[PDB]
Amino acid sequence: SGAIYVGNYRVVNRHLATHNDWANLVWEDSSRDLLVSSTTAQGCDTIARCDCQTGVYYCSSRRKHYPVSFSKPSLIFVEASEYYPARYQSHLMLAVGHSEPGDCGGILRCQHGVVGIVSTGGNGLVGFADVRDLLWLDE
Ligand SMILES: NC(=O)[C@H]1CCCN(C(=O)CN2CCOc3ccc(Cl)cc32)C1
């Protein structure tokens, strides 16, 4: 569990979206595991507009923040699950670090702000769904 709150938007993992998220839907992408829904309250999360590859992510399974080196956003194969079949997830960054199933939604941050949220993991790795290309979140 975890979300990004920027202005009049709420960015969540598409597989964890609730009924209100789909009733106030702005944009969703199964291949990115993202869903953005509208909000009545004014959010203040600063989105990073950068090309960073180092930052800090929040790990609910260890109740700790961790500094990571991560890859540039790309098409990475993800095994089938109870939310999606076997596909290539796009805009996904990988890093060496602890992650377990309840960790989806933990924020990844750099000096410039929010980079993305935990989406995949396993075998001593962590995957983040990037949000830095979505310039409409700010405008
Ligand atoms: N992006 C996706 O398709 C997600 C949707 C459901 C969750 N996904 C998983 O990988 C589930 N899982 C299995 C392997 O061990 C893990 C360790 C950490 C995390 Cl965050 C998830 C998992 C794929």
Ligand SMILES: [Zn+2]
């Ligand atoms: Zn940055």
